[PDB]
Design a protein around this ligand. Structure first.
Ligand SMILES: O=P(O)(O)OC[C@H]1O[C@](O)(CO)[C@@H](O)[C@@H]1O
Ligand SMILES: O=[P-]([O-])[O-]
Ligand SMILES: [Mg+2]
Ligand SMILES: [Mg+2]
Ligand SMILES: [Mg+2]
Length: 328
């Protein structure tokens, strides 16, 4: 009978810190969308929600039925939250400007459904978000979303896996909340999460081996054949960024989606995939790099810009940076 909900947490983390309560509003609204997406996903084959929606998005993906449903759910709750002014979604070509009577101070970048390749085989999928405070006094516009990730005030993801988890990072740390399906509340289950300084798992799609740069190649070879005859790392690659990053957070190790000979900026999207996960990792004591610079320091020029990303345990990411620096 003492429910420590996401709501309470985010409020109790603010009592002697004169806010506006808009962030709690925003996050309460997002939680409602995440619950609705979770329920849909958990019944998707009965509800006939698998398959394509007939459309390609700006970054060239095959839009799925659950992409449109989730996108609509998040847009509508953020609008009605009265906490937002500019929204950027993977699924919309342009930024969405909130109508004047519903504007609040925040800019939200999100991936409404991440891991579409895994939808139909029931593997874990998720929702990814990053929140900024609007800076300018100018009328809200797409340019308010073009901030470096270091300006994030909150970021995180929902993981629709064996259980549904909302992982929320803010200035003071990372906390995990699990959805209780019986009462429709996110309950705190992991407080002030920190990543292991060094892990034992590497996560990458090795089908791209023919296209990797020499530094990624060398690093993978080192994980399999350690020069100091330590045990080789195990390999894991679920194929859904939210699942692979969440495992990296809670078990340690490294996740990679690097640049390659065909994709100079990699595949994952900077605003609503790379920056939120880089922020979570940095707040958990981890690192997130392109191989040459910190993801959170990139100043974007395109709301659908791609970025290479290598993230996880700091000693693992640093070892790979050392190999890039050696090859440079
Ligand atoms: O099939 P690939 O090229 O390994 O891409 C998988 C990645 O694509 C995404 O689905 C994003 O498009 C991520 O969730 C996942 O990390
Ligand atoms: O591109 P997608 O799996 O969010
Ligand atoms: Mg997609
Ligand atoms: Mg995604
Ligand atoms: Mg998506």
């Amino acid at each position: 009978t003492n429910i420590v909900t996401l709501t309470r947490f985010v409020m109790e983390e603010g009592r002697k810190a004169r806010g506006t309560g808009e962030m709690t509003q925003l996050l309460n609204s997002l939680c409602t969308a995440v619950k609705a997406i979770s329920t849909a996903v958990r019944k998707a084959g009965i509800a006939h929600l698998y398959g394509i929606a007939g459309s390609t998005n700006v970054t060239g993906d095959q839009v799925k039925k659950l992409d449109v449903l989730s996108n609509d759910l998040v847009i509508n709750v953020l609008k009605s939250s009265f906490a937002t002014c500019v929204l950027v979604s993977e699924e919309d070509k342009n930024a969405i400007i909130v109508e004047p009577e519903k504007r609040g101070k925040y800019v939200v970048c999100f991936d409404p459904l991440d891991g579409s390749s895994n939808i139909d085989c029931l593997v874990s999928i998720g929702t990814i978000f990053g929140i900024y405070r609007k800076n300018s006094t100018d009328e809200p516009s797409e340019k308010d979303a073009l901030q470096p990730g270091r300006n994030l005030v909150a970021a995180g993801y929902a993981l629709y896996g064996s259980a549904t988890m909302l992982v929320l990072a803010m200035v003071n740390g990372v906390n995990c909340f699990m959805l209780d399906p019986a009462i429709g509340e996110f309950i705190l289950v992991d407080r002030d999460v920190k990543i292991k300084k060094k892990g034992s798992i590497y996560s990458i799609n090795e089908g791209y081996a023919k296209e990797f740069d020499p530094a990624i190649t060398e690093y993978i070879q080192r994980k399999k054949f350690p020069p100091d005859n330590s045990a080789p790392y195990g390999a894991r690659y679920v194929g859904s960024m939210v699942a692979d990053v969440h495992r990296t957070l809670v078990y340690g190790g490294i996740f990679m989606y690097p640049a390659n000979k065909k994709s100079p900026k990699g595949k994952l999207r900077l605003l609503y995939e790379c920056n939120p996960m880089a922020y979570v990792m940095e707040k958990a004591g981890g690192l997130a790099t392109t191989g040459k610079e910190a993801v959170l320091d990139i100043v974007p020029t395109d709301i659908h810009q791609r970025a290479p990303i290598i993230l996880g345990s700091p000693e693992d990411v640093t070892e790979l940076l050392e190999i890039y620096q050696k090859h440079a």
